[PDB]
Amino acid sequence: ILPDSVDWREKGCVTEVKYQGSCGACWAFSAVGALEAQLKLKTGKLVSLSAQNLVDCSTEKYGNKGCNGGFMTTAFQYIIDNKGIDSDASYPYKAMDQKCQYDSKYRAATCSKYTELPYGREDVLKEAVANKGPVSVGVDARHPSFFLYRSGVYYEPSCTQNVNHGVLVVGYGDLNGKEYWLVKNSWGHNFGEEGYIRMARNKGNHCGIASFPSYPEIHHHH
Amino acid sequence: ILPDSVDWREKGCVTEVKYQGSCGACWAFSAVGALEAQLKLKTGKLVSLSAQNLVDCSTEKYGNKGCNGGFMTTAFQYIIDNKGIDSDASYPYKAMDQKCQYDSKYRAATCSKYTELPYGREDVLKEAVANKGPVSVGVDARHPSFFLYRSGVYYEPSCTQNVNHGVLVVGYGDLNGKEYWLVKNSWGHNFGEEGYIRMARNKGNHCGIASFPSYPEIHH
Ligand SMILES: Nc1nc2cc(C(F)(F)F)ccc2n1Cc1ccco1
Secondary structure (H helix, E strand, C coil): CCCCCEECCCCCCCCCCCECCCCECHHHHHHHHHHHHHHHHHHCCCCCECHHHHHHHCCHHHCCCCCECCCHHHHHHHHHHHCCEEECCCCCCCCCCCCCCCCHHHEEECCCEEEECCCCCHHHHHHHHHHCCCEEEEECCCCHHHHCCCCCEECCCCCCCCCCEEEEEEEEEEECCEEEEEEECCECCCCCECCEEEEECCCCCHHHCCCCCEEEECCCCC | CCCCCEEHHHHCCCCCCCECCCCECHHHHHHHHHHHHHHHHHHCCCCCECHHHHHHHCCHHHCCCCCECCCHHHHHHHHHHHCCEEECCCCCCCCCCCCCCCCHHHEEECCCEEEECCCCCHHHHHHHHHHCCCEEEEECCCCHHHHCCCCCEECCCCCCCCCCEEEEEEEEEEECCEEEEEEECCECCCCCECCEEEEECCCCCHHHCCCCCEEEECCC
16 A cells, blocks of 8 residues: 655655756656666665766667657666666766767666556556656656746646656655655756656646656666 | 947836747747837837737748747738737737637737848847847747746857747846846746846857847837
C-alpha cells in the first residue's frame, strides 16, 4: 500500500539542481538524475553523473541530437552499451556539443536495464515513484505558465500530452488536497521552488507527465 | 542630437502588459503595441487594440498562422488593407484561433503605412525609438536565461540573430554602463520587471533585436 506522499530528496537520493543553459540537454539531466538515485540506493554514495557524457556520446545511433534534444530511454541504453557513465566531476557540463571524451577510468555508475511504464498511467507512475525511485518523464513545457512558474501546484488547462521537455519525478504529495508530482527541472535553482515544480497529479495525465516514463536499474559496478 | 535615454511609458504611449498565454500571438501583441503608441500620439487617447483581431483576420494572405506565429509587418498590412482594427474592449483576446469577427463599427485605429528598418542597424533603431515611437522587433527568446530574466541588462552569449518572438521596443538607456533596449513582452506581469526586459544594446545586434524592426503610421 503506497504512501500518501514521497520525497526522494529526504532519502539523500537527489543531487543539486543543474542549469542546462542554452543547450537542450533536459533529457540527459533527467536520465543521469534517475541513475544517481539508483547509485545512492545501491552504494550509499550520492554522485552527480555526467549529463555532458550523454550529450557528447549518446548521439545519432541512439536517436539523440545533443543540445537539440534526446530520449531518456536511449540515454539509459547508451550507458548499458558503453558499460558506464563518468562522474560529472570528471566530465563536467559545458552546455555544447563536443566530441565523445568518455574514459572508463572515471566511470561512476553502470546501468543493466531500464523499465518503460505504460502510457498515461498515473497510478503505475505513483507505484514506481514510491517503490523504485525517481522516474524520468517528458512534459509539455511549451507554455509561459510553465516557464514563469514560481510556486504551488501547477495546473494549466492548455497543456497537452505532447511532451517536449525531459524532467525527473522525485516524489508526489498534495497541497491542501491538490495532488501533485514533485518534479526536478534542469533550469537552475532560480526556476520554480529552488529548481522544482509541483505539477497537477490525477488530472488526466496533465502536461503528459505519465506519457513516457522510464527508470534505470544497476546490477554490477566492478 | 538624440537623447541619452527614452521611455515612451513616460508619455502615456504604452498600454498595460498583456499575457498571450499558450497562444503564439507575440507578433500580434507587438504590432498592436506599436500602433497603440501612434494612436495616442494622433488622438491623445491611449486605447488597447485587438491582438485577437490580428490572430483571427490577418491569416493566409499575410503569411500569418494565428496562435502558430506571424509577422508584425504583414499585420500592419492587414490593418492598412482592412481600413481598421477593433479595440481590445470590442474584440477581446481569447488565446485561440477563431473566425474573423472584425466589425468596422468598433474600429479604434487605422494605419496608413509602415516602415521597415535596415538589418542589424542599432543606430537607426535608436533614431526611430527617439523620433517616431515604440518599434516592433523580433528577438531570439529560446534561452532559459530569457524566460528566467528578473532584472538588470540581459546579456546571453548563446543568443543568435535568428529571431522567433515579437516584442516592442519602448525605449532605451544605460544602466550602470550597460546600454539597453527597454522591451515590452506579452508574457504578463510575472516576466522580467513587471513584464519588461532590458536587452543589451550596441553589442552586435544581440538576440537579433535590430534584425527586423518596423513601425506603423496613421494619417487619419
Ligand atoms: N521581416 C520579419 N519580421 C519578422 C518577425 C519575426 C517574429 F518572430 F519576431 F515575429 C520573425 C522573423 C521576421 N522577419 C524576417 C523574415 C523575412 C522573411 C521572412 O521572415
